[model samples]
Target: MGAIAKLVAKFGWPIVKKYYKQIMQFIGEGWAINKIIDWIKKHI
Candidate 1:
């Protein structure tokens, strides 16, 4: 990774503050889906 890529991977703060919540929401949804799959396997 070059300087730019390295910075992005390490501390790439979002340039758009308004979209932070949206990004977090998407991440949460992905985690929720994965957790649901794990729960289903455990119970069934």
Candidate 2:
């Protein structure tokens, strides 16, 4: 996994869960971070 994925997996999930229902009801979707690493690899 990338560095950002690792750090968020470690810290972000716990905080997100605390306000789960409220946040979901407000936004209608959860958060996800996607990387474009494959494109960078092709250029490399």
Candidate 3:
């Protein structure tokens, strides 16, 4: 993805952070989510 796409991806963290509990309820509090977020932060 381009820089803008990259930025949006990173920017998504706030919403994700805000709704993390609800999100986890849907996706589950699994290692996979943590890994994906870690990857995003790392590559950002």
| TM-score against truth, every candidate | 0.32, 0.35, 0.34
List the candidate numbers ranked by lDDT, top first: 3, 2, 1
Tens-digit lDDT track for model 3 on 12-33? 8564565455445444444344
Tell me how candidate 1 scores on lDDT.
0.37
Off by over 4 Å in 2: 1-11, 29-44
lDDT of each: 0.37, 0.39, 0.47
Kindly give the stretch of ten consecutive residues in candidate 2 with the minimal lDDT sum: 35-44
Global Cα lDDT for candidate 2: 0.39
Better of 1 and 2 by lDDT: 2
lDDT of 2 by residue, 9-42 (tens): 5445564455444434443454333322232233
- Candidate 3: misplaced stretches above 4 Å? 1-11, 29-44
lDDT for residue 21 in candidate 2, whole number 0-100: 46
Query: Residue 36 deviation, candidate 1, in Å?
Result: 21
Pairs in steric clash, model 2: none
Clashing pairs in 1: none
Quick one: ranking by TM-score, best first? 2, 3, 1
